[PDB]
Amino acid sequence: QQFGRDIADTTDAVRDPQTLEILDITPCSFGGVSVITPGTNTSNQVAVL
Amino acid sequence: QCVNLTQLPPAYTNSSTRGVYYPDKVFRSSVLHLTQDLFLPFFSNVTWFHRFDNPVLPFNDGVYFASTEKSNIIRGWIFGTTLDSKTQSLLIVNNATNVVIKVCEFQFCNDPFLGVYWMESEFRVYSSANNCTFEYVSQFKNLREFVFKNIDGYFKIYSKHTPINLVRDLPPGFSALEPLVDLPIGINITRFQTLLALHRAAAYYVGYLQPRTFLLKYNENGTITDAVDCALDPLSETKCTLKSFTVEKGIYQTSNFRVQPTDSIVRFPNITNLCPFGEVFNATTFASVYAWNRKRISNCVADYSVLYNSTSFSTFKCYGVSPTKLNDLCFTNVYADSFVITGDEVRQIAPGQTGKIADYNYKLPDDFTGCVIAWNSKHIDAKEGGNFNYLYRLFRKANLKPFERDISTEIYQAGSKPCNGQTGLNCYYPLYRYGFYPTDGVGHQPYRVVVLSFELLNAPATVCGPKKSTNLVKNKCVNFNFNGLTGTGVLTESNKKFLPFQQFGRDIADTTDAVRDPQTLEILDITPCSFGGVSVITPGTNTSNQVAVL
Amino acid sequence: YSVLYNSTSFSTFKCYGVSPTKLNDLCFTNVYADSFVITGDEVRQIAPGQTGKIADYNYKLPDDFTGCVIAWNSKHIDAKEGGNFNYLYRLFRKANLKPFERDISTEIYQAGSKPCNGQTGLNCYYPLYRYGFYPTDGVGHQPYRVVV
Amino acid sequence: TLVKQLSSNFGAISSVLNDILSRLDPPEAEVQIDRLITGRLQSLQTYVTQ
Amino acid sequence: SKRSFIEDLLFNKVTLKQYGDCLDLICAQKFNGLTVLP
Ligand SMILES: *[C@@H]1O[C@H](CO[C@@H]2O[C@@H](C)[C@@H](O)[C@@H](O)[C@@H]2O)[C@@H](O[C@@H]2O[C@H](CO)[C@@H](O)[C@H](O)[C@H]2NC(C)=O)[C@H](O)[C@H]1NC(C)=O
Ligand SMILES: *[C@@H]1O[C@H](CO[C@@H]2O[C@@H](C)[C@@H](O)[C@@H](O)[C@@H]2O)[C@@H](O[C@@H]2O[C@H](CO)[C@@H](O)[C@H](O)[C@H]2NC(C)=O)[C@H](O)[C@H]1NC(C)=O
Ligand SMILES: *[C@@H]1O[C@H](CO)[C@@H](O[C@@H]2O[C@H](CO)[C@@H](O)[C@H](O)[C@H]2NC(C)=O)[C@H](O)[C@H]1NC(C)=O
Ligand SMILES: *[C@@H]1O[C@H](CO)[C@@H](O[C@@H]2O[C@H](CO)[C@@H](O)[C@H](O)[C@H]2NC(C)=O)[C@H](O)[C@H]1NC(C)=O
Ligand SMILES: *[C@@H]1O[C@H](CO)[C@@H](O[C@@H]2O[C@H](CO)[C@@H](O)[C@H](O)[C@H]2NC(C)=O)[C@H](O)[C@H]1NC(C)=O
Ligand SMILES: *[C@@H]1O[C@H](CO)[C@@H](O[C@@H]2O[C@H](CO)[C@@H](O)[C@H](O)[C@H]2NC(C)=O)[C@H](O)[C@H]1NC(C)=O
Ligand SMILES: *[C@@H]1O[C@H](CO)[C@@H](O[C@@H]2O[C@H](CO)[C@@H](O)[C@H](O)[C@H]2NC(C)=O)[C@H](O)[C@H]1NC(C)=O
Ligand SMILES: *[C@@H]1O[C@H](CO[C@@H]2O[C@@H](C)[C@@H](O)[C@@H](O)[C@@H]2O)[C@@H](O)[C@H](O)[C@H]1NC(C)=O
Ligand SMILES: *[C@@H]1O[C@H](CO[C@@H]2O[C@@H](C)[C@@H](O)[C@@H](O)[C@@H]2O)[C@@H](O)[C@H](O)[C@H]1NC(C)=O
Ligand SMILES: *[C@@H]1O[C@H](CO)[C@@H](O)[C@H](O)[C@H]1NC(C)=O
Ligand SMILES: *[C@@H]1O[C@H](CO)[C@@H](O)[C@H](O)[C@H]1NC(C)=O
Numbered sequence: 065q066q067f068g069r070d071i072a073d074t075t076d077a078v079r080d081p082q083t084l085e086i087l088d089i090t091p092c093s094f095g096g097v098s099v100i101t102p103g104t105n106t107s108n109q110v111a112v113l
Numbered sequence: 114q115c116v117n118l119t120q121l122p123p124a125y126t127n128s129s130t131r132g133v134y135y136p137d138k139v140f141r142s143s144v145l146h147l148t149q150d151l152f153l154p155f156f157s158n159v160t161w162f163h164r165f166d167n168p169v170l171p172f173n174d175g176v177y178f179a180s181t182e183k184s185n186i187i188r189g190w191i192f193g194t195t196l197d198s199k200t201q202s203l204l205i206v207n208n209a210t211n212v213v214i215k216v217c218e219f220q221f222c223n224d225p226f227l228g229v230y231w232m233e234s235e236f237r238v239y240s241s242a243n244n245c246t247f248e249y250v251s252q253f254k255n256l257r258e259f260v261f262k263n264i265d266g267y268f269k270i271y272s273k274h275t276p277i278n279l280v281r282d283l284p285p286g287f288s289a290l291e292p293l294v295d296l297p298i299g300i301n302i303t304r305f306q307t308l309l310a311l312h313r314a315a316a317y318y319v320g321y322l323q324p325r326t327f328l329l330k331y332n333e334n335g336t337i338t339d340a341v342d343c344a345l346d347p348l349s350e351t352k353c354t355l356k357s358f359t360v361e362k363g364i365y366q367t368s369n370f371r372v373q374p375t376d377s378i379v380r381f382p383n384i385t386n387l388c389p390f391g392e393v394f395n396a397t398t399f400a401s402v403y404a405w406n407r408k409r410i411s412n413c414v415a416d417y418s419v420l421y422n423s424t425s426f427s428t429f430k431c432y433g434v435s436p437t438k439l440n441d442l443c444f445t446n447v448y449a450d451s452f453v454i455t456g457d458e459v460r461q462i463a464p465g466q467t468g469k470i471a472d473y474n475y476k477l478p479d480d481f482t483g484c485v486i487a488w489n490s491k492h493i494d495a496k497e498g499g500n501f502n503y504l505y506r507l508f509r510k511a512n513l514k515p516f517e518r519d520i521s522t523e524i525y526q527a528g529s530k531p532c533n534g535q536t537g538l539n540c541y542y543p544l545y546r547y548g549f550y551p552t553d554g555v556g557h558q559p560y561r562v563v564v565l566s567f568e569l570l571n572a573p574a575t576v577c578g579p580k581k582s583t584n585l586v587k588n589k590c591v592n593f594n595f596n597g598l599t600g601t602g603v604l605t606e607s608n609k610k611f612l613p614f615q616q617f618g619r620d621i622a623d624t625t626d627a628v629r630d631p632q633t634l635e636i637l638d639i640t641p642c643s644f645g646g647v648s649v650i651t652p653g654t655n656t657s658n659q660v661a662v663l
Numbered sequence: 664y665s666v667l668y669n670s671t672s673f674s675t676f677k678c679y680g681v682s683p684t685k686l687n688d689l690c691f692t693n694v695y696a697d698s699f700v701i702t703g704d705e706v707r708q709i710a711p712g713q714t715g716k717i718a719d720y721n722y723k724l725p726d727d728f729t730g731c732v733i734a735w736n737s738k739h740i741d742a743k744e745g746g747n748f749n750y751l752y753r754l755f756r757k758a759n760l761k762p763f764e765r766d767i768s769t770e771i772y773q774a775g776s777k778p779c780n781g782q783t784g785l786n787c788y789y790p791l792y793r794y795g796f797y798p799t800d801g802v803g804h805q806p807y808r809v810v811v
Numbered sequence: 812t813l814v815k816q817l818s819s820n821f822g823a824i825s826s827v828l829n830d831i832l833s834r835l836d837p838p839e840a841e842v843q844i845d846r847l848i849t850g851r852l853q854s855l856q857t858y859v860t861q
Numbered sequence: 862s863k864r865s866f867i868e869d870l871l872f873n874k875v876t877l878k879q880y881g882d883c884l885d886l887i888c889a890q891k892f893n894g895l896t897v898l899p
């Protein structure tokens with residue numbers, strides 16, 4: 065086996081060809097960030113959750 | 114080099130849930146997959162053979178072969194068509210050390226067999242091998258299962274090997290065979306036979322593959338762990354519909370997996386004489402491009418294969434159809450336009466082109482259904498002192514319209530003052546002559562062009578392809594081909610009287626409803642193969658495996 | 664592929680399941696090569712879905728084919744003075760081939776009604792014919808080497 | 812309406828499925844079949860939503 | 862069906878096929894997969 069996918073049919077782990085060592089791939093994007101803001105008219109301060 | 118060595122009708126059994134292989138080479142893990150492929154149906158009839166009694170058996174689409182043995186009697190197989198040294202055959206043997214695979218031209222003996230007596234003897238398989246395109250070497254307690262297929266020039270063998278203790282029958286159970294080999298032999302196979310290793314008992318069961326839809330379950334290691342044959346009973350069909358191996362209480366309106374069309378019938382009208390391809394293809398003198406020639410073709414069996422040994426077309430381009438489906442179609446009306454142009458202007462004979470030929474001499478419509486054929490004719494149209502017999506038009510006031518002809522020979526006025534004849538400074542004669550010498554470069558050598566434009570509509574067929582008709586099968590699910598109109602369904606008699614010319618009639622859903630038989634002018638009508646109102650009453654599949662059908 | 668720039672000039676290079684600009688970045692698992700020689704005008708029939716004489720009786724490609732087809736003119740190596748009658752082809756067959764099938768039989772094709780049983784008479788033909796490659800041929804029937 | 816919607820060719824050469832399979836070979840037919848499939852799923856989805 | 866006079870008046874005003882008969886517009890939609898349950 066060279067690579068392994070997951071349920072979503074996206075590649076999940078891969079094998080290094082030169083040194084036969086397994087690696088795995090995770091997304092670059094964090095998708096759970098929310099920005100608490102008052103009106104941008106009043107002020108330019110935010111908080112992050 | 115070989116010798117000739119009471120028979121009884123062989124018994125039968127059922128392959129309960131055996132014979133599942135891997136349909137394709139893709140890798141799938143932890144998934145339920147619905148596939149349609151050639152499989153061995155569950156609870157299907159296998160022939161149980163054995164005493165030696167080596168027969169030659171058919172090879173339909175693939176073969177499941179199972180053997181139970183204790184002393185290595187079964188040795189290998191031979192596959193072929195005639196097995197008679199006039200064609201190529203495949204031989205797979207296991208001579209107790211290696212695996213020998215040979216694609217050659219053997220002259221097989223009537224009853225092949227290896228020999229054991231205690232070193233070795235009696236290699237009485239064939240007499241001589243000649244051409245040998247392929248060579249491959251590799252230097253009751255057992256049940257051995259194999260599946261053989263061959264497609265697209267690959268011979269694929271899947272196998273499994275399990276220990277058993279039950280003696281005199283094929284055990285019930287479940288087996289998933291792993292891929293074993295995939296050889297690129299590229300031969301035609303229709304029959305096969307097995308080789309026995311004599312001593313001077315064991316059994317084999319043979320079953321055939323058929324097209325089926327299966328539901329497969331894939332393990333973590335991508336090993337098939339369970340399978341459902343979706344044409345067996347209503348419970349299997351409702352498991353297939355939901356894509357699951359379990360069902361709770363309910364009513365479960367189901368889909369159709371239970372009927373597969375079997376036969377295929379063809380009906381074409383009785384046309385015998387072949388088309389005049391040879392009076393419109395050599396035709397000592399062709400026509401000038403500006404005055405091209407149009408001719409109608411009718412009452413033909415349009416065979417293109419009678420031109421293989423005469424002409425070699427540099428260009429053959431069909432537009433509304435596919436070149437591989439011209440042998441199955443009947444056309445209603447066919448024309449042919451012929452002319453002669455220069456080698457570099459054959460690219461302008463196409464819908465949407467521009468230049469000199471497509472602007473002033475010959476134009477094709479945008480929605481054009483037909484084919485264009487061209488071939489080089491330097492040997493017939495070129496002479497020593499030139500061949501100044503073909504003309505073309507160079508000046509015109511405006512572009513042509515599709516399939517228009519302009520044979521006028523007025524004096525084109527390119528300047529301001531009127532010409533009124535007398536081709537002077539800015540007045541030109543609009544027709545010029547091609548000069549074809551036998552030493553020209555390929556860019557301006559003569560080329561002959563023929564354009565065929567056909568139509569298909571609700572009317573009797575005039576020219577049709579070279580396909581042989583067959584018998585009519587009624588009240589069955591068949592594929593049918595009536596005058597190049599293909600379909601699937603059940604053919605029964607009807608009473609929907611047509612018009613004199615009408616060939617078929619559709620319905621409100623714009624699907625064909627009735628058709629006319631071409632040979633015997635009798636109306637038939639087409640109904641679907643599928644019954645779509647069946648529901649399956651079931652308790653939990655956990656409690657019991659009984660159902661009722663509504 | 665860059666060690667062939669100064670030797671051969673391909674008249675035809677056509678890839679089907681991939682892009683020619685992405686062959687330097689791919690590793691393949693299994694690779695075959697089919698080679699033969701045909702006439703210049705029959706190089707258009709080496710394609711999925713074509714018909715004619717070569718694609719019907721000699722060499723056929725599947726519809727779902729992933730690969731490349733390469734052809735080049737070889738009048739300088741395959742043509743001789745008194746012709747080169749060393750390449751054959753099949754002209755008569757009972758039925759069309761299937762993809763990647765080979766047929767080397769040399770029976771007597773029966774085109775009429777009565778059986779032939781050898782003795783190629785009126786409506787019985789030998790099914791293999793020879794290419795004749797002279798060095799003065801037009802470009803339409805000069806030899807071409809094809810690799811798939 | 813769901814049955815009258817079967818006369819529409821959603822950009823395909825024809826709305827009848829047996830005149831595409833009798834004139835074109837699979838690689839050239841899968842481009843029209845994949846337009847008819849996409850156009851005939853939308854009608855079912857609209858019906859279900861309504 | 863043991864229904865009253867008023868119900869008999871009501872059932873007539875509102876205007877609401879065996880497979881042996883289809884072998885119109887109901888059979889055209891029965892062959893295309895559309896079924897009406899009871
Ligand atoms: C694939 O090659 C790497 C690197 O190969 C090294 O350099 C080459 C030019 C040649 O000299 C090879 O023989 C060398 O091995 C291999 O990685 C090396 O592994 C060795 C242990 O065997 C280690 O001592 C080196 O430091 C490694 N070098 C690097 C740069 O990582 C690798 O083992 C080879 N893969 C296979 C097929 O095992
Ligand atoms: C189309 O042909 C069928 C079969 O043609 C018969 O066999 C041919 C080789 C040739 O000998 C024809 O002349 C034959 O008729 C015709 O069906 C036949 O019809 C006749 C009555 O005229 C009947 O006696 C035969 O038994 C039928 N044969 C079969 C096999 O059905 C058919 O009539 C022709 N269609 C037309 C144009 O009418
Ligand atoms: C299919 O074949 C199997 C195997 O022969 C049959 O199983 C036999 O069933 C009978 C009655 O259930 C038993 O008495 C035998 O002992 C079974 N034999 C073996 C070896 O298991 C089975 O009945 C056949 N029929 C189908 C369609 O399932
Ligand atoms: C069984 O397998 C093959 C069948 O030919 C033979 O083994 C090889 O046979 C060739 C031809 O006789 C020899 O040149 C090789 O040296 C043999 N050895 C190898 C590579 O297997 C032989 O008849 C049988 N094998 C043996 C070794 O008994
Ligand atoms: C397989 O080899 C046989 C050997 O008989 C070939 O038949 C031809 O036989 C004649 C002598 O009768 C030879 O002069 C030819 O050279 C043989 N042809 C070739 C090309 O080998 C048979 O044709 C061969 N099969 C093929 C087509 O390769
Ligand atoms: C068909 O014929 C008409 C008449 O000869 C052509 O139309 C004329 O075109 C000239 C310029 O080329 C104009 O000055 C005339 O006024 C046009 N007359 C009319 C009645 O429109 C026309 O060009 C021809 N069509 C084609 C296909 O070329
Ligand atoms: C593969 O081989 C079979 C057997 O030689 C060929 O099938 C026969 O075709 C002839 C007409 O060409 C029929 O008369 C026979 O009845 C057919 N036999 C069978 C068993 O079908 C078949 O044509 C070959 N296939 C290919 C690819 O050409
Ligand atoms: C094929 O036709 C032959 C005469 O045609 C000539 O030779 C062939 C090979 C081509 O080069 C063609 O262009 C030539 O005009 C016949 O002698 C031969 O028997 C034919 N083959 C058949 C029908 O068996
Ligand atoms: C290129 O190859 C040369 C010999 O090949 C001949 O000349 C070239 C230019 C082509 O016309 C080829 O078809 C001929 O066969 C070498 O002499 C030359 O050095 C090569 N170039 C390199 C590798 O630098
Ligand atoms: C924005 O801030 C200004 C200055 O304080 C104020 O005059 C105005 O009403 C504010 N507008 C909004 C939309 O909040
Ligand atoms: C075996 O039987 C076949 C059947 O025709 C025959 O041709 C052959 O000569 C026989 N061989 C022997 C050795 O009797």
Ligand SMILES: *[C@@H]1O[C@H](CO)[C@@H](O)[C@H](O)[C@H]1NC(C)=O
Nearest residue numbers: 124125126127156157158159
């Ligand atoms: C298998 O074949 C035999 C004889 O042809 C027949 O009696 C038996 O019913 C068949 N089995 C099935 C399941 O059709």
Ligand SMILES: *[C@@H]1O[C@H](CO)[C@@H](O)[C@H](O)[C@H]1NC(C)=O
Nearest residue numbers: 143331332333334335336338
């Ligand atoms: C895969 O195979 C290994 C044996 O090599 C086994 O231990 C493991 O349980 C298997 N995975 C499964 C059954 O999901």
Ligand SMILES: *[C@@H]1O[C@H](CO)[C@@H](O)[C@H](O)[C@H]1NC(C)=O
Nearest residue numbers: 390391392393394395396397
């Ligand atoms: C042209 O075709 C006709 C029709 O078969 C044939 O009789 C004639 O011999 C052909 N002429 C040449 C020169 O091939």
Ligand SMILES: *[C@@H]1O[C@H](CO)[C@@H](O)[C@H](O)[C@H]1NC(C)=O
Nearest residue numbers: 359360361653654655656657
């Ligand atoms: C299935 O049947 C078993 C045995 O009777 C019982 O123990 C279990 O609870 C049942 N499970 C379900 C899901 O009904």
